[PDB]
Design a protein around this ligand. Structure first.
Ligand SMILES: [Mg+2]
Ligand SMILES: [Mg+2]
Ligand SMILES: [Mg+2]
Ligand SMILES: [Mg+2]
Ligand SMILES: [Mg+2]
Ligand SMILES: [Mg+2]
Ligand SMILES: [Mg+2]
Ligand SMILES: [Mg+2]
Ligand SMILES: [Mg+2]
Ligand SMILES: [Mg+2]
Ligand SMILES: [Mg+2]
Ligand SMILES: [Mg+2]
Ligand SMILES: [Mg+2]
Ligand SMILES: [Mg+2]
Ligand SMILES: [Mg+2]
Ligand SMILES: [Mg+2]
Ligand SMILES: [Mg+2]
Ligand SMILES: [Mg+2]
Ligand SMILES: [Mg+2]
Ligand SMILES: [Mg+2]
Ligand SMILES: [Mg+2]
Ligand SMILES: [Mg+2]
Ligand SMILES: [Mg+2]
Ligand SMILES: [Mg+2]
Ligand SMILES: [Mg+2]
Ligand SMILES: [Mg+2]
Ligand SMILES: [Mg+2]
Ligand SMILES: [Mg+2]
Ligand SMILES: [Mg+2]
Ligand SMILES: [Mg+2]
Ligand SMILES: [Mg+2]
Ligand SMILES: [Mg+2]
Ligand SMILES: [Mg+2]
Ligand SMILES: [Mg+2]
Ligand SMILES: [Mg+2]
Ligand SMILES: [Mg+2]
Ligand SMILES: [Mg+2]
Ligand SMILES: [Mg+2]
Ligand SMILES: [Mg+2]
Ligand SMILES: [Mg+2]
Ligand SMILES: [Mg+2]
Ligand SMILES: [Mg+2]
Ligand SMILES: [Mg+2]
Ligand SMILES: [Mg+2]
Lengths: 129, 139, 149
RNA sequence: UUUUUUUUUUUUUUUU
RNA sequence: GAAGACGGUCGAACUUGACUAUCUAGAGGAAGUAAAAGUCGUAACAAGGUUUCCGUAGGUGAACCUGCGGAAGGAUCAUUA
RNA sequence: CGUGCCUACCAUGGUGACCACGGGUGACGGGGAAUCAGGGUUCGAUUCCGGAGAGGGAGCCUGAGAAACGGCUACCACAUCCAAGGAAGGCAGCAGGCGCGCAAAUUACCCACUCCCGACCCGGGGAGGUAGUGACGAAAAAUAACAAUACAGGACUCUUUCGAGGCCCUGUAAUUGGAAUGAGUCCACUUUAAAUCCUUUAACGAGGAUCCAUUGGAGGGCAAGUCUGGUGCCAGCAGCCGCGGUAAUUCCAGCUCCAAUAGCGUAUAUUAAAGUUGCUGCAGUUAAAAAGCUCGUAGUUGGAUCUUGGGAGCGGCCCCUUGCCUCUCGCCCGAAGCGUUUACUUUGAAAAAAUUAGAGUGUUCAAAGCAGGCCCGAGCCGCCUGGAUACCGCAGCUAGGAAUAAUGGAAUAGGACCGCGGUUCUAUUUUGUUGGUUUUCGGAACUGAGGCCAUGAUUAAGAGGGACGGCCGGGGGCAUUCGUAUUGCGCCGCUAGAGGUGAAAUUCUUGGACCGGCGCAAGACGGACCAGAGCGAAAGCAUUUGCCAAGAAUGUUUUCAUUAAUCAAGAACGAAAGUCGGAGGUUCGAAGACGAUCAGAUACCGUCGUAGUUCCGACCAUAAACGAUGCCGACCGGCGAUGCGGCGGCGUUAUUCCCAUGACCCGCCGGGCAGCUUCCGGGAAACCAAAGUCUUUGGGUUCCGGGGGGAGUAUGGUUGCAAAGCUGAAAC
RNA sequence: CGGAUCCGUAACUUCGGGAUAAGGAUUGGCUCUAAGGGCUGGCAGCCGACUUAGAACUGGUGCGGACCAGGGGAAUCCGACUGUUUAAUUAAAACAAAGCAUCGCGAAGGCCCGCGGCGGGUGUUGACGCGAUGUGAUUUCUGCCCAGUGCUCUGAAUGU
């Protein structure tokens, strides 16, 4: 039924970007989703956001810039050992000028660019550009 | 509606191993009846003995009579009509000669103008019809 | 989405955001627990006891006024059902549907609904054997149903 | 209300 | 300390029987393919001249016909007070 | 030696849908090879590692080491010599022969290199190495050029030039030189065990008879002939499309061209092309494809939640959470408790070469090889440097990292930690020394009594289950009642037609049909109200009434607290028809019968009429079982409806007179069946608010399709009483 | 061949059988060994049944030692089978038989006996009964003819 709620969040983000609306409602909340949007915010692709704290499970409302072509989730959360990123680079990123990958390292939810410097690797959550 | 979990490699391998059989090339590659049903035994060429000289019909948009040789095989023992290529070479083939034969373009199918002959004569008495055609040696 | 139905409606209840009881109902934990013992001696389902305290005594969600869930209030002094309610109602209707098939041994619809009800029983029984509230060799064929009505 | 059949192949494509 | 012998164990082989695998003869029967040029009709495509089709039974030279229940891939996206 | 390795006794076990057991392999296993985005797919007979066997198969002596076979014993199958009394045989070692084939080299030379064995510096080695065959394959590479003079087929800088040509391309069967140099012909060195080959060098060695490049092709794909002569759907070409029947851009020849070049065509296995096997990365409304529907185990996936901002210091460390303890051992560290436990990463070892990547290095280049490079006029009785590094799936080891994803704990307290009692048990030091008696003590355990912890249970998923309560529905079963009509019968009146058709006839008819009137009986069926309305998992369900259980939606500050979704095996329902019993038999009606129509009808039309249609029991499990759209979940436009709940609305209306539910009207919420519109976005389109959120391709999961035919056929197994159903191929 | 023990048993089929199918081995005498129980006492002591399994020795390969005692397979036709029959020539494929059909009859009746009576029988019975035939398990089937010949229903319908 309800599984991998990161996908449920990011397909709503995708439909709202393709439609052209301003702000999205997402009924589940995860620390995964919050740190994912933190990476997207720090790299500037979204705007400011706000978490309605339900006692049960909150709801995230995100102001949208309008730059987001495509965000999404790789489904089974594959492992990625280092010196195996370049497969995912050529397979997922639209170019060698932009695009980002969200790894899950032991030292936090990191970025494709911070991961190669921190020299960790780990599991893939998703991608956005 | 695929399957994409991390622990589903058995289901994927077993379903792909089942669904690989319905391809015709794979099933005649790795099912035994294609090898043990046809002549040549899966080889390129075979020798044989001329049994008789047979003219056969052609198809309907192009009508002619093609010239072929019925062959007892040395190796297997099956009888084969084999097409004799050029203008002459029916004169160059006599009765009961050692004849080397091969296929045409794909072994499961004949050529378009010819109904049921799948085989092409290369040599007669260890001399090619190419040499017999453009002035080379003799029978 | 319901299990054994296409009907995916929404008929639920929604607890408010606000925690423990607002201003009125000067009714501490002791009086509430004494009420719930006097009701459980009369032997009502805890599902019913929540409704009784909601409608008569004006008690809200009892987790707020007492701090503790009502079946834990029940078990800690041991007025237990010893056969939990969520299995008990399914067995109670399964007995009646078996009897109805017996005196009407042609009712294919009731036969099918009996199969669905027994499926729900086996699901909840595997849950209770996992969570160890029940003995692991507990079974359900006919005679346990006819006894523990 | 009727009322069926009628050889066989003949038919290729441009520069600005 | 030789030849030989009772008994044991290993077990070559030979016969017989069973099981299984691969081909392989067969009077006749029944099928498909070739295949275009033959005889008998004209089932289908247009309401194909009885709308078509799907199941399940029965019959008939032949395609086919009919019974009962469905579908529209139907020839009806509509029939009022 | 350890062991069911074997014996005896005893127990009744072990494996499997996470594929056991059994068949097949044209299967020896790896290191590897081919194939180029990435991921893979196909081989690995074969030079290195390891295993096995010497015709099959069995046994055995010697020896540290064998079930040895260039050792032995017997049998089987071959086969040699026989004076017929007996002997010896084992090339899947090296050459060589027969057979088999589509398919494969000389009965050569040498221990000189490499190493190996023996008593041993010396013997021996078909192990090896050298030569001969060798178009398996690879590397480098002339094949007659080359600059010329002249004629220009004439382009080009540009001047009225009708050319200056200090540039040019090319045909010159035109001449001239370099007569460049090579292949072959041979002296001599070297090479080598002996020669050979390569290099070096001497003497010859080119003017189109030269010292001669072929293989395919010229319609499209596909670069290149609408050139010529023959040929007349004949011959033949063509991998497919196709050409050829008197003008052939395609056959056969010649000429001219085109492509690769000392290598081209062909056949076949196989890889890419093939996103036409799809994990990245395919389809499933109509083309092939979503099972009839539902439950259901194994499998697969599984909501959220439990460690944070900072500080010091520039320009990585500590905490306000950031490794706890013990200081027994040599304020702190060494050391030690030392892990709930893995999955995941980053280390680090570890491993075998050869291959691949790749560093260096002028093998004349290159494929290679692992070498080489300097000064020195021989004189230095010499120096420098290399023979790298990477990669090595998976599994195992080691230490950091705790996010992601599972697991741990304390709920009947049989918790956590500190400090006591009391029971009970032993260890070694010391009473100068030996021994005994009694301890302190050190450790385990047992037991009881407390105090102490903020003393212990994440909240309730627009997940789910269940209770609840007001209605709801052609939902299901059992029973009951009603209604015409049909058919037949009984009477009653009238009277010659009545049915039935495209038109008629079969048939009933003065023995009174049809028609009217009354009444009775039987069985089937529930019209009109009935709709793009409801309900059911579907197949389906329509007269009233009662009984029996069951269910959706709605309302809920109700309960439980992850019980969830999809599901191979397995299972319950499943229309019509069909089959087996029992009851009856109105209408219809397969089969069958006739009458007509037609050339023929056995067909449509009409008359009669069998089984079945009905009910009760059992079976069969199929359909265009259709929305030709698996199931769950979320998001993405609007509009008016309609059905069912719930809520709001001094609007209207019926009671009697508040009061409620009644009946409309207005509006909102939930989810259901639907519809109009649209450039939401899609698709091949028709079309779809899903068939969308897809080259920007990944929410979870089951079933499936791989050109059409053969064919849902054969053949096996299994179910069925039978009809048949389920599973299901190949030749061609 | 034949008893017994231990192995192993096909095709077909109504799934019950076939089946002691087919085919093998073993079997003696004498020594043991192991197992299989009862009654007593506050786990131990006394007292007994005839069976099974295994081992060694050994006899001139001999072992159900006499007696006792299934030849087997492959097929075809017919009849389902068990049953019964021509005593004194037949044992069957005939006969019956269950099953399947068919017909008469609601008691003043059917079908019969009887020389006779409302005398008997079925009947101390009543359509799931009695009476009269055809066929002969199951499985699958039951076609076409009312002309002949029967049988039956109908009406003084109208000829005799
Ligand atoms: Mg072909
Ligand atoms: Mg389900
Ligand atoms: Mg005709
Ligand atoms: Mg027609
Ligand atoms: Mg028609
Ligand atoms: Mg049809
Ligand atoms: Mg033993
Ligand atoms: Mg082999
Ligand atoms: Mg490659
Ligand atoms: Mg690769
Ligand atoms: Mg080897
Ligand atoms: Mg060996
Ligand atoms: Mg040897
Ligand atoms: Mg040898
Ligand atoms: Mg050619
Ligand atoms: Mg030509
Ligand atoms: Mg071209
Ligand atoms: Mg060709
Ligand atoms: Mg496809
Ligand atoms: Mg179609
Ligand atoms: Mg289709
Ligand atoms: Mg499961
Ligand atoms: Mg989770
Ligand atoms: Mg009447
Ligand atoms: Mg039915
Ligand atoms: Mg029938
Ligand atoms: Mg019967
Ligand atoms: Mg009967
Ligand atoms: Mg009729
Ligand atoms: Mg089907
Ligand atoms: Mg489905
Ligand atoms: Mg389905
Ligand atoms: Mg309403
Ligand atoms: Mg009401
Ligand atoms: Mg027999
Ligand atoms: Mg007998
Ligand atoms: Mg016969
Ligand atoms: Mg008999
Ligand atoms: Mg008698
Ligand atoms: Mg007799
Ligand atoms: Mg009588
Ligand atoms: Mg019979
Ligand atoms: Mg008859
Ligand atoms: Mg008559």
């Amino acid at each position: 039924v309800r599984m991998n709620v990161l996908a449920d969040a990011l397909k709503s983000i995708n439909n709202a970007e393709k439609r052209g609306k301003r702000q999205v409602l997402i009924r589940p909340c995860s620390k995964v989703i919050v740190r994912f949007l933190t990476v997207m915010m720090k790299h500037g692709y979204i705007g400011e956001f706000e978490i309605i704290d339900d006692h049960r499970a909150g709801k995230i409302v995100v102001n949208l810039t309008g730059r987001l072509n495509k965000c999404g989730v790789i489904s089974p959360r594959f492992d990625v050992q280092l010196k195996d990123l370049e497969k995912w680079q050529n397979n997922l990123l639209p170019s060698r000028q932009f695009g980002f990958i969200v790894l899950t390292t032991s030292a936090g939810i990191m970025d494709h660019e911070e991961a190669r410097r921190k020299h960790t690797g780990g599991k893939i959550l998703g991608f956005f550009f | 509606g695929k399957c994409r979990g991390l622990r589903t490699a058995r289901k994927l391998r077993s379903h792909r191993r089942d669904q690989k059989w319905h391809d015709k090339q794979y099933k005649k590659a790795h099912l035994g009846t294609a090898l043990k049903a046809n002549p040549f035994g899966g080889a390129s060429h075979a020798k044989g003995i001329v049994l008789e000289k047979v003219g056969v019909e052609a198809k309907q948009p192009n009508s002619a009579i093609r010239k072929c040789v019925r062959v007892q095989l040395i190796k297997n023992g099956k009888k084969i009509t084999a097409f004799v290529p050029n203008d002459g070479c029916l004169n160059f083939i006599e009765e009961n000669d050692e004849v080397l034969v091969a296929g045409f373009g794909r072994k499961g199918h004949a050529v378009g103008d010819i109904p049921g002959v799948r085989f092409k004569v290369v040599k007669v008495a260890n001399v090619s019809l190419l040499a017999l055609y453009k002035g080379k040696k003799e029978r | 989405g319901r299990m054994h139905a296409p009907g995916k409606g929404l008929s639920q209840s929604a607890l408010p955001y606000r925690r423990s009881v607002p201003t009125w109902l000067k009714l501490t934990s002791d009086d509430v627990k004494e009420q719930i013992y006097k009701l459980a001696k009369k032997g009502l389902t805890p599902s019913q006891i929540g409704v009784i305290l909601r409608d008569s005594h004006g008690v809200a969600q009892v987790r707020f006024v007492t701090g503790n869930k009502i079946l834990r209030i029940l078990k800690s002094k041991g007025l237990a059902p010893d056969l939990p309610e969520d299995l008990y109602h399914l067995i109670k209707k399964a007995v009646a549907v078996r009897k109805h098939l017996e005196r009407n041994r042609k009712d294919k619809d009731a036969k099918f609904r009996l199969i669905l009800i027994e499926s729900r029983i086996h699901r909840l029984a595997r849950y209770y054997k996992t969570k160890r509230v029940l003995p692991p060799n507990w079974k359900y064929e006919s005679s346990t149903a006819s006894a523990l009505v």
